[PDB]
RNA sequence: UAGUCCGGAUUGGAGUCUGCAACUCGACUCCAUGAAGUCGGAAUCGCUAGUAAUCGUGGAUCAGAAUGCCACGGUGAAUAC
RNA sequence: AAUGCCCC
RNA sequence: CGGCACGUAGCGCAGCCUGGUAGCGCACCGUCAUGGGGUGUCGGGGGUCGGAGGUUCAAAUCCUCUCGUGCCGACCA
């Protein structure tokens, strides 16, 4: 986990995008690629299409997701089973 | 080895009594190169043995070894389709060394509390002709006796 | 010999005795004994009842079996419902902290299941 | 001792013909056109254990016998006799040398072995198919130059001799099949 | 109540850490020491601390903010 | 003399550091948790003296990332008919 | 002087 | 047609009499040995009794009916 004194990390393009979203009050799927950003309270309720390699998986941010990072919710390998 | 006979290396006598064979015994007992630990163990066991026995540590140890020592032992050869078991007499130094080894192994086997206590019980029982070490001596003599037909 | 809803062994020293509680290890136990002014060499046998009541006070100041397992399970369940990576990992029963799974995952995968 | 007629008994019955218990193993009834009916029974002499062949006449017939088998459990041997017991009646019983022929080396103690008793008296004991036994004597196997499996002769705590692979030494319990007299596994 | 059948059953004192003494008839034989009785059990002041609901966004904004 | 004051795997929570950035995938720390394991089947490996065995230390690579690799010393044996 | 088959 | 004795793991057989557990050999799976294959050694897994209805506390087993496969003769006219 990142050091505490540094504060939580987030990409500035994602920051500007989510500010634009919350000021437009529009439910558009926010496409992104930053699986390293940390989910912020200002994103609760937003539908973020985050990258996983192949394509963009849509995640709906809930009150609980405020700690994790978008990579937690974009799974990146596909495993069905061995038989 | 194939080519040469070799000379034996010298061992300094034990510090407390100054005896080559007790030095050999503590060496045999040692593991991991913890000579100090082996020495503490063997001297504690020797102290309590002398207590139980009366007579001094040297003669107590010597009678235990006299009881555990083998005279003739066996070796296998696999002559034809059936393997053999040839009884060959045991040269002194070897009988002493493997007697000490049998004793320390019986001690490791015995389940008492401490290693010193195990070794002490083992030495006393061997001095009085009992215990797995002297039983192994019996078994060695018995095999050899059985296969005496070979020479 | 009975604290925080568990019976405690009565001959072992107080530190180990309190570690026998779920939610109290060695350092937490030493903290308990210090805060209650009880020595460590003493066993639960030969210990007055007011002392054991102080011990109960301290262990209640901490969080223990009932509350602890409820917290643990609620957290695990929160993960598994969130459905984050740790969530899927918990649900499928594989190492969560990032260990390898190509081999050597037997603590999470139990004994080996031969292919048939 | 209800008398049994030839075209009546199928396999399993224990007929008593000629002062001797038997056991019908198989039987073929024939009713040809124009002649007396008969049965070709594949009998089994129940004392020496040899299979006899008897063509019986519809009419020709024999009394039954009290030959029965159930699960007794071996207890002990003393002199020339072997004693066994039931687990549902706990009735004591004693056999003799004849009954235990070549199964002496297979029974140890507490083995649950089927026995055939006749006249309320055993005549033949069947050792459990697999018995766990310990080896009294072996030659320490040395691979030497062996290129094939080799095998090794090994006496057992009951006298028997079996070929054990190479490693079984002394004091190791093995498993042998009484039926074939052969090593199956070294029971750890 | 038959005579020799049933076990002994006498008045026994029960003292807890709540500071309440209780005269009870029971089969315990000797006296009795309690750790928790009814009136002291954390059952009426525990329904919140034994659940510990909390809130993650509150935890986060307390941890740090803009 | 106990699955233990052995063993530390696994997991929960909380942190430090490097680095734009530790989700996938770092290392380490604190609290709790305390699996398997009670000496290892057939088979198999290294070693003849400061050697084996055991105990620590350093270096290269490298921001971070070794139980690997390359070195260093401490204790220090058995046996070779 | 037990066993020891074969290599497109 | 009857009577009759079978139907049990991939194959071949036990068990069933005398109700409570399904066993044996080969095969099959994974090591080991070997330059590699085999023989061999060490370990593992697999069926629920052709089907249905009864008796029973409970049926592979006892009854009865069905399906399938073998064997015997279905003769004097
Ligand atoms: Mg003796
Ligand atoms: Mg011995
Ligand atoms: Mg800890
Ligand atoms: Mg890793
Ligand atoms: Mg132990
Ligand atoms: Mg480091
Ligand atoms: Mg265990
Ligand atoms: Mg080598
Ligand atoms: Mg050399
Ligand atoms: Mg090292
Ligand atoms: Mg190092
Ligand atoms: Mg460096
Ligand atoms: Mg060194
Ligand atoms: Mg060929
Ligand atoms: Mg006519």
Phi-psi map region of C98: left, alpha, beta (phi>0 left; psi -120 to 50 alpha): left
CB-nearest partner of E35 from C2, C70, C71: C2
- What is the number of other CB atoms lying within 10 angstroms of the CB of residue C35? 13
- What is the number of other CB atoms lying within 10 angstroms of the CB of residue B7? 6
From residue D67, alpha-carbon distances to D9, D23, D47, D109, E59 in Å are 15, 9, 11, 25, 86
Range of the domain at A18: 2-82
Tokens linked to D186:
């070294």
CA distance D47 to D103: 15
Q: What is the DSSP letter of D28?
A: E
Q: Is E61 helix (H, G, I), strand (E, B) or coil?
A: helix
- What is the number of other CB atoms lying within 10 angstroms of the CB of residue D5? 14
Q: Report the b/e string of B36-47 with b at 16+ CB within 10 A.
A: eebbebbbbbbe
Q: Which residues contact C36 (CB under 8 A, 6 or more apart)?
A: C51, C54, C55, C57, C58
Method: cryo-EM
Nearest residue to D25 via CA among D35, D39, C69, D38:
D39
CA distance D174 to D108: 13
Nearest CA in chain E to C73: E51
Please name the helix (run of DSSP H) or strand (run of DSSP E) that holds residue B74, with its range, or none: strand B72-76
> In degrees, to the nearest 5, what angle opens at C-alpha D101 toward C-alphas D96 and D106?
105
Give domain B20-147's CATH superfamily.
Ribosomal protein S7/S5 (1.10.455.10)
Nearest nucleotide by C1' position to the B38 CA atom: F77
CA distance D176 to D184: 5
Inter-chain touch A68–C82, beta carbons under 8 Å: yes
Inter-chain touch D140–B78, beta carbons under 8 Å: no
In chain D, the DSSP E strands lie at 3-5, 26-30, 38-42, 53-57, 61-63, 67-78, 81-85, 92-94, 112-118, 122-126, 130-134, 137-138, 152-155, 161-164, 173-177, 182-186
Q: Supply φ then ψ for residue C45, to 5 degrees.
A: -60, 150
Residue D61's Cβ-count burial label (10 Å; 0-12, 13-18, 19+) is middle
- Name the β-bridge partners of D163: D153
In A16-60, the DSSP E strands lie at 30-31, 47-51, 56-60
CA distance A74 to B146: 77
Please name the helix (run of DSSP H) or strand (run of DSSP E) that holds residue C6, with its range, or none: strand C6-7
- Which chain D residues 99-128 have CB under 7 A to strand H? none
How many folded domains does chain A comprise?
Answer: 1
Q: Report the b/e string of A20-52 with b at 16+ CB within 10 A.
A: ebeeeeeeeebebbbbebbbbeebbebebbbbb
Alpha helices (runs of H) in C9-115, residue ranges in sequence order:
14-19, 26-35, 49-61, 65-82, 85-92, 106-109
Nucleotides of F under 7 A from a protein CB: 1, 4-5, 9-19, 21-27, 30-35, 41-43, 48-49, 52-54, 74-81
- What is the number of other CB atoms lying within 10 angstroms of the CB of residue A6? 8
Q: Which residues contact B47 (CB under 8 A, 6 or more apart)?
A: B57
Tokens linked to C69:
């397992």
CA-based radius of gyration for chain C: 20
Provide the resolution (angstroms): 3.1
Contact yes or no for B23/B11 (Cβ under 8 A): yes
B72/H40 CA-to-C1' distance in Å? 37
Q: What is the DSSP letter of D139?
A: P
Q: What is the DSSP letter of A6?
A: T
Give me the total of CB pairs closer than 8 Å, taking one residue from chain A and one from chain C: 18
Provide the pairing of β-strand D92-94 with D81-85.
antiparallel
- Which chain D residues 129-158 have CB under 7 A to strand G? 144-150
CA distance A12 to B106: 74
Q: Residue for token digits 């057992």?
A: D156
Give me the total of CB pairs closer than 8 Å, taking one residue from chain A and one from chain E: 19
Provide the pairing of β-strand E10-15 with D3-5.
unpaired
- Name the β-bridge partners of D114: D71, D126
CA distance B37 to B33: 9
Nearest residue to D3 via CA among D16, D18, D22:
D16
Nearest residue to B42 via CA among B67, B20, B16, B62:
B16
C2-65 is classed CATH 1.25.40.80: no
CA distance B62 to B119: 15
CA distance B85 to B2: 23
Q: Residue for token digits 């089994």?
A: D44
Q: How far is the CA of C28 from the centre of ligand 3 (A)?
A: 10
Residues in chain E after which the chain is broken, C→N over 2.5 Å = none
- Name the β-bridge partners of A59: A48
Contact yes or no for D135/D94 (Cβ under 8 A): no
Q: What are all long-range contacts of D52-61, with beta carbons under 8 Å and residues at least 24 apart?
A: D52/D22, D56/D6, D57/D6, D58/D5, D58/D6, D58/D7, D59/D5, D59/D6, D60/D6, D61/D3, D61/D4, D61/D5, D61/D6
Alpha helices (runs of H) in chain B, residue ranges in sequence order:
20-29, 35-53, 57-68, 92-109, 115-127, 132-146
Tokens linked to D75:
């207890």
Residues of E in contact with C71 (CB under 8 A): 52
Tokens linked to D91:
């009735």
So where are chain B's domains? 20-147
CA distance D152 to D154: 6
Dmax (CA) of chain E: 81
How many angstroms separate the CA of residue D80 from the nearest CA in chain B?
A: 30
Tokens linked to A13:
């393009």
Residue E31's Cβ-count burial label (10 Å; 0-12, 13-18, 19+) is exposed
| Residue-level length of chain E | 66
CA distance D159 to D137: 9
Inter-chain touch B76–D145, beta carbons under 8 Å: no
Contact yes or no for D76/D95 (Cβ under 8 A): no
To the nearest 10°, the Cα dihedral for C42, C44, C50, C54? 80
Provide the pairing of β-strand A47-51 with A30-31.
parallel
- What is the number of other CB atoms lying within 10 angstroms of the CB of residue D176? 22
């Amino acid at each position: 986990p990142r050091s505490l004194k540094k504060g939580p990390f987030i990409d500035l393009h994602l920051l500007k995008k989510v500010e634009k979203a919350v000021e437009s009050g529009d439910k558009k799927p926010l496409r992104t690629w930053s699986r390293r950003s940390t989910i912020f309270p200002n994103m609760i309720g937003l539908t973020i299409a985050v990258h996983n390699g192949r394509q963009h998986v849509p995640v709906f941010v809930t009150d609980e997701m405020v700690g994790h990072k978008l990579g937690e919710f974009a799974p990146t390998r596909t495993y069905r089973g061995h038989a | 080895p194939r080519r040469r006979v070799i000379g034996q290396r010298k061992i300094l006598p034990d510090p407390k009594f100054g005896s080559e064979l007790l030095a050999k015994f503590v060496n045999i007992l040692m593991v991991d190169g913890k000579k100090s630990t082996a020495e503490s163990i063997v001297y504690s066991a020797l102290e309590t043995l002398a207590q139980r026995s009366g007579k001094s540590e040297l003669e107590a140890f010597e009678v235990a070894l006299e009881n555990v020592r083998p005279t003739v032992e066996v070796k296998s050869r696999r002559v034809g389709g059936s393997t053999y078991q040839v009884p060959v007499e045991v040269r002194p130094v070897r009988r002493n060394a493997l007697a000490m080894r049998w004793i320390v192994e019986a001690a490791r086997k015995r389940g008492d509390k401490s290693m010193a206590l195990r070794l002490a019980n083992e030495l006393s029982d061997a001095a009085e002709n009992k215990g797995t070490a002297v039983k192994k001596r019996e078994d060695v003599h018995r095999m050899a006796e059985a296969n005496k037909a070979f020479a | 010999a009975r604290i925080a809803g568990i019976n405690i062994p009565d001959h072992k020293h107080a530190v180990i005795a309190l570690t026998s509680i779920y939610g109290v290890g060695k350092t937490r136990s030493k903290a308990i004994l210090a805060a209650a002014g009880i020595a460590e060499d003493v066993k639960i046998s030969e210990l007055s009842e007011g002392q054991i009541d102080t011990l109960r006070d301290e262990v209640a100041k901490f969080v223990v079996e009932g509350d602890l397992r409820r917290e643990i399970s609620m957290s695990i369940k929160r993960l598994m419902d969130l459905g984050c990576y740790r969530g899927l990992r918990h649900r499928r029963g594989l190492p969560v902290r990032g260990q390898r799974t190509k081999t050597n995952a037997r603590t999470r995968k139990g004994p080996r299941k031969p292919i048939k | 001792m209800a008398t049994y007629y030839s075209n009546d008994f199928r396999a399993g019955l224990k007929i008593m013909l000629d002062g001797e218990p038997y056991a019908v193993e198989a039987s073929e009834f024939v009713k040809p056109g124009k002649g007396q009916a008969f049965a070709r029974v594949k009998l089994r002499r129940l004392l020496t254990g040899t299979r006899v062949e008897k063509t019986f006449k519809s009419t020709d017939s024999a009394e039954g016998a009290d030959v029965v088998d159930m699960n007794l459990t071996y207890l002990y041997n003393d002199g020339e006799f072997w004693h066994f017991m039931n687990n549902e009646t706990f009735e004591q019983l004693s056999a003799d040398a004849k009954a235990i022929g070549d199964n002496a080396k297979w029974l140890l103690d507490q083995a649950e072995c089927i026995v055939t008793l006749w006249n309320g008296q055993p005549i033949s004991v069947t050792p459990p198919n697999f018995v766990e036994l310990e080896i009294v004597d072996t030659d320490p196997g040395l691979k030497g130059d062996t290129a094939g499996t080799g095998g090794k002769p090994a006496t057992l705590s009951t006298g028997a001799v079996v070929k054990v692979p190479l490693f079984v030494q002394i004091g190791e319990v093995i498993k042998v099949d009484t039926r074939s007299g052969e090593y199956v596994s070294r029971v750890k | 109540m038959k005579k020799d059948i049933h076990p002994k059953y006498e008045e026994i004192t029960a003292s807890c850490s709540c500071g309440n003494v209780m005269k009870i008839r029971s089969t315990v034989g000797h006296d009795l020491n309690l750790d928790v009785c009814s009136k002291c059990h954390p059952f009426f002041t525990g329904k919140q601390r034994d659940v510990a609901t909390g809130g993650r966004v509150d935890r986060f904004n307390k941890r740090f903010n803009i």
